[PDB]
Amino acid sequence: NVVEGKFHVTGGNVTTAAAACAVDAGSVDQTVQLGQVRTASLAQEGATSSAVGFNIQLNDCDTNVASKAAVAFLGTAIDAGHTNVLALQSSAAGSATNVGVQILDRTGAALTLDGATFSSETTLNNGTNTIPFQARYFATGAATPGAANADATFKVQYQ
C-alpha cells in the first residue's frame, strides 16, 4: 500500500532577455526519485513525504550581465485549491490519487507552478553556481496506492 514514482523536470534559460549563465547540460533534463511512501503516511490533506533534493547548475556566469538568478516552474496543478502541487501523470499500473508533487526552493517554500512565480533569488559568483531545490509528495486527502509520477519544466531568469 504505497505510492512510488519519479519527478521529471526539463528546462533552460529565459530566452527573452540576456542570460548571464549557461544551464549545465546535466540540469536541463533530470529525473528525481521520490521514493516509496506508505499511504498511511499520506492519509490526510497536508501530509507530506520526506523531500528529495535536486539541483540546477549554471555555468560560465558573468556577473557583469546579471548578479542574481531565479527559477520558475510550470506544470499542471493538481486542483484549483493546490496551485503549488503538481498533478500526477496517468499510468498503466493505475496512478495514486489524492496526492501530488511539490517543488521546494532553498527556503523550504513550495513554489507555484504557473511559470510566472520565480524561486528565491540566488546571488551569483562568476563561473559555476548551483541553485538547490527539493521535491516531495503532498497529500490532498487520503492517498491511495499506485504510481505517482509528475513532470514540470523550468526557466532560469536573471536580474
mmCIF file of C-alpha atoms in Angstrom:
data_model
loop_
_atom_site.group_PDB
_atom_site.id
_atom_site.type_symbol
_atom_site.label_atom_id
_atom_site.label_comp_id
_atom_site.label_asym_id
_atom_site.label_seq_id
_atom_site.Cartn_x
_atom_site.Cartn_y
_atom_site.Cartn_z
ATOM 1 C CA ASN A 1 0.000 0.000 0.000
ATOM 2 C CA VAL A 2 2.428 2.651 -1.268
ATOM 3 C CA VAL A 3 2.848 5.427 -3.795
ATOM 4 C CA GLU A 4 6.073 5.320 -5.804
ATOM 5 C CA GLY A 5 7.356 7.403 -8.683
ATOM 6 C CA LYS A 6 9.753 9.937 -10.131
ATOM 7 C CA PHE A 7 9.768 13.676 -10.773
ATOM 8 C CA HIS A 8 10.913 14.515 -14.311
ATOM 9 C CA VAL A 9 11.993 18.090 -14.981
ATOM 10 C CA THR A 10 13.458 19.827 -18.036
ATOM 11 C CA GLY A 11 14.321 23.464 -18.554
ATOM 12 C CA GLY A 12 16.649 26.179 -19.711
ATOM 13 C CA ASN A 13 17.254 29.909 -19.677
ATOM 14 C CA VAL A 14 14.608 32.516 -20.248
ATOM 15 C CA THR A 15 15.225 33.359 -23.903
ATOM 16 C CA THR A 16 13.594 36.817 -23.987
ATOM 17 C CA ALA A 17 16.473 38.565 -22.190
ATOM 18 C CA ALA A 18 20.232 38.237 -21.899
ATOM 19 C CA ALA A 19 21.373 35.181 -19.956
ATOM 20 C CA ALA A 20 24.236 35.628 -17.515
ATOM 21 C CA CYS A 21 24.977 31.875 -17.461
ATOM 22 C CA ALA A 22 24.679 28.668 -19.428
ATOM 23 C CA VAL A 23 22.462 25.977 -17.915
ATOM 24 C CA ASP A 24 24.517 22.845 -17.289
ATOM 25 C CA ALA A 25 23.619 20.020 -19.688
ATOM 26 C CA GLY A 26 23.157 17.729 -16.687
ATOM 27 C CA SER A 27 20.469 20.059 -15.313
ATOM 28 C CA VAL A 28 18.363 20.651 -18.437
ATOM 29 C CA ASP A 29 16.826 17.157 -18.182
ATOM 30 C CA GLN A 30 16.667 15.338 -14.838
ATOM 31 C CA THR A 31 14.641 12.641 -13.123
ATOM 32 C CA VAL A 32 14.320 12.734 -9.335
ATOM 33 C CA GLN A 33 13.390 9.550 -7.486
ATOM 34 C CA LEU A 34 10.676 10.463 -4.993
ATOM 35 C CA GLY A 35 10.904 7.112 -3.193
ATOM 36 C CA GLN A 36 8.477 4.591 -1.749
ATOM 37 C CA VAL A 37 5.955 6.119 0.664
ATOM 38 C CA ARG A 38 3.250 4.206 2.518
ATOM 39 C CA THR A 39 -0.233 5.634 2.033
ATOM 40 C CA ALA A 40 -0.656 5.561 5.822
ATOM 41 C CA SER A 41 1.928 8.368 5.968
ATOM 42 C CA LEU A 42 -0.111 10.278 3.339
ATOM 43 C CA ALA A 43 -3.524 9.644 4.881
ATOM 44 C CA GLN A 44 -4.802 13.231 5.191
ATOM 45 C CA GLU A 45 -4.643 16.556 3.382
ATOM 46 C CA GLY A 46 -1.394 18.381 4.098
ATOM 47 C CA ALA A 47 0.657 15.278 4.895
ATOM 48 C CA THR A 48 3.988 15.289 3.064
ATOM 49 C CA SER A 49 6.769 12.836 2.303
ATOM 50 C CA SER A 50 10.439 13.411 3.073
ATOM 51 C CA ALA A 51 11.782 15.784 0.439
ATOM 52 C CA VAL A 52 14.364 14.691 -2.133
ATOM 53 C CA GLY A 53 16.990 17.117 -3.382
ATOM 54 C CA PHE A 54 17.797 18.169 -6.913
ATOM 55 C CA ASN A 55 19.994 20.961 -8.249
ATOM 56 C CA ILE A 56 20.075 23.285 -11.240
ATOM 57 C CA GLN A 57 23.689 24.079 -12.074
ATOM 58 C CA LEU A 58 24.622 27.202 -14.030
ATOM 59 C CA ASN A 59 27.989 27.514 -15.768
ATOM 60 C CA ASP A 60 30.200 30.321 -17.048
ATOM 61 C CA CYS A 61 28.232 33.008 -15.221
ATOM 62 C CA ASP A 62 29.208 36.628 -15.859
ATOM 63 C CA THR A 63 28.032 38.834 -13.002
ATOM 64 C CA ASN A 64 28.528 41.917 -15.182
ATOM 65 C CA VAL A 65 25.491 40.666 -17.129
ATOM 66 C CA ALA A 66 23.405 39.895 -14.037
ATOM 67 C CA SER A 67 24.081 39.474 -10.330
ATOM 68 C CA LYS A 68 21.187 37.122 -9.468
ATOM 69 C CA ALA A 69 19.315 34.124 -10.842
ATOM 70 C CA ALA A 70 15.979 32.526 -10.003
ATOM 71 C CA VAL A 71 13.888 29.687 -11.412
ATOM 72 C CA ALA A 72 10.187 29.414 -12.282
ATOM 73 C CA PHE A 73 8.484 26.049 -12.761
ATOM 74 C CA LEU A 74 5.484 25.187 -14.929
ATOM 75 C CA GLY A 75 3.261 22.142 -14.559
ATOM 76 C CA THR A 76 -0.331 21.027 -14.213
ATOM 77 C CA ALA A 77 -1.718 21.987 -10.811
ATOM 78 C CA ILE A 78 -3.451 19.077 -9.103
ATOM 79 C CA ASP A 79 -6.564 21.183 -8.475
ATOM 80 C CA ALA A 80 -7.618 24.805 -8.165
ATOM 81 C CA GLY A 81 -7.165 24.570 -4.387
ATOM 82 C CA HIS A 82 -3.485 23.483 -4.581
ATOM 83 C CA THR A 83 -1.748 25.511 -7.303
ATOM 84 C CA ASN A 84 1.663 24.629 -5.812
ATOM 85 C CA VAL A 85 1.062 20.868 -6.117
ATOM 86 C CA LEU A 86 1.637 19.005 -9.379
ATOM 87 C CA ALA A 87 -0.946 16.610 -10.731
ATOM 88 C CA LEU A 88 0.267 13.056 -11.230
ATOM 89 C CA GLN A 89 0.782 11.588 -14.677
ATOM 90 C CA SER A 90 -1.519 8.773 -15.720
ATOM 91 C CA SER A 91 -0.034 5.282 -15.743
ATOM 92 C CA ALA A 92 -0.948 1.813 -16.962
ATOM 93 C CA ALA A 93 -0.475 0.402 -13.444
ATOM 94 C CA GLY A 94 -3.074 2.823 -12.063
ATOM 95 C CA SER A 95 -1.817 6.056 -10.547
ATOM 96 C CA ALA A 96 -2.291 7.069 -6.931
ATOM 97 C CA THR A 97 -4.976 9.601 -6.012
ATOM 98 C CA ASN A 98 -5.330 12.463 -3.527
ATOM 99 C CA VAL A 99 -1.583 13.115 -3.747
ATOM 100 C CA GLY A 100 0.647 15.287 -5.908
ATOM 101 C CA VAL A 101 4.237 16.543 -6.063
ATOM 102 C CA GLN A 102 5.610 19.820 -4.708
ATOM 103 C CA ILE A 103 8.786 21.661 -5.682
ATOM 104 C CA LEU A 104 10.528 23.498 -2.826
ATOM 105 C CA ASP A 105 13.290 26.088 -3.107
ATOM 106 C CA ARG A 106 16.099 26.682 -0.596
ATOM 107 C CA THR A 107 13.694 28.489 1.751
ATOM 108 C CA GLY A 108 11.582 25.323 2.055
ATOM 109 C CA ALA A 109 8.550 27.013 0.492
ATOM 110 C CA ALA A 110 6.568 25.145 -2.134
ATOM 111 C CA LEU A 111 6.593 27.048 -5.418
ATOM 112 C CA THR A 112 3.593 27.984 -7.521
ATOM 113 C CA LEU A 113 3.647 26.118 -10.815
ATOM 114 C CA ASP A 114 2.240 28.679 -13.264
ATOM 115 C CA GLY A 115 5.522 29.632 -14.962
ATOM 116 C CA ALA A 116 5.403 33.177 -13.540
ATOM 117 C CA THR A 117 6.434 32.625 -9.899
ATOM 118 C CA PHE A 118 10.192 32.628 -9.520
ATOM 119 C CA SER A 119 12.118 30.973 -6.710
ATOM 120 C CA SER A 120 14.190 32.863 -4.159
ATOM 121 C CA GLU A 121 16.983 34.785 -5.852
ATOM 122 C CA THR A 122 20.488 33.324 -5.788
ATOM 123 C CA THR A 123 23.357 35.808 -5.723
ATOM 124 C CA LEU A 124 25.819 34.652 -8.385
ATOM 125 C CA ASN A 125 29.561 34.369 -8.394
ATOM 126 C CA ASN A 126 31.338 34.303 -11.722
ATOM 127 C CA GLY A 127 31.636 30.812 -13.151
ATOM 128 C CA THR A 128 29.627 27.888 -11.821
ATOM 129 C CA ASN A 129 26.654 28.319 -9.488
ATOM 130 C CA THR A 130 24.129 25.794 -8.214
ATOM 131 C CA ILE A 131 20.531 26.544 -7.242
ATOM 132 C CA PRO A 132 19.249 23.757 -4.945
ATOM 133 C CA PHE A 133 15.661 22.530 -4.882
ATOM 134 C CA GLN A 134 13.650 19.694 -3.383
ATOM 135 C CA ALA A 135 10.686 17.578 -4.453
ATOM 136 C CA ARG A 136 8.219 15.652 -2.309
ATOM 137 C CA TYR A 137 4.729 14.179 -2.220
ATOM 138 C CA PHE A 138 1.873 16.297 -0.871
ATOM 139 C CA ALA A 139 -1.447 14.730 0.119
ATOM 140 C CA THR A 140 -4.685 16.453 -0.873
ATOM 141 C CA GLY A 141 -6.645 13.779 1.014
ATOM 142 C CA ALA A 142 -6.353 10.099 1.922
ATOM 143 C CA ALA A 143 -3.799 8.932 -0.635
ATOM 144 C CA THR A 144 -4.422 5.663 -2.479
ATOM 145 C CA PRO A 145 -1.582 3.382 -3.636
ATOM 146 C CA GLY A 146 -0.205 3.357 -7.157
ATOM 147 C CA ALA A 147 2.342 5.009 -9.424
ATOM 148 C CA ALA A 148 2.930 8.673 -8.551
ATOM 149 C CA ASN A 149 4.988 10.361 -11.272
ATOM 150 C CA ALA A 150 4.969 14.071 -12.048
ATOM 151 C CA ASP A 151 6.698 16.322 -14.557
ATOM 152 C CA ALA A 152 7.419 20.019 -14.958
ATOM 153 C CA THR A 153 9.536 22.477 -16.908
ATOM 154 C CA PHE A 154 11.650 25.362 -15.631
ATOM 155 C CA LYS A 155 13.014 28.689 -16.830
ATOM 156 C CA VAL A 156 16.026 30.493 -15.341
ATOM 157 C CA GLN A 157 15.623 34.270 -15.099
ATOM 158 C CA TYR A 158 18.462 36.704 -14.415
ATOM 159 C CA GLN A 159 18.282 40.012 -12.561
#
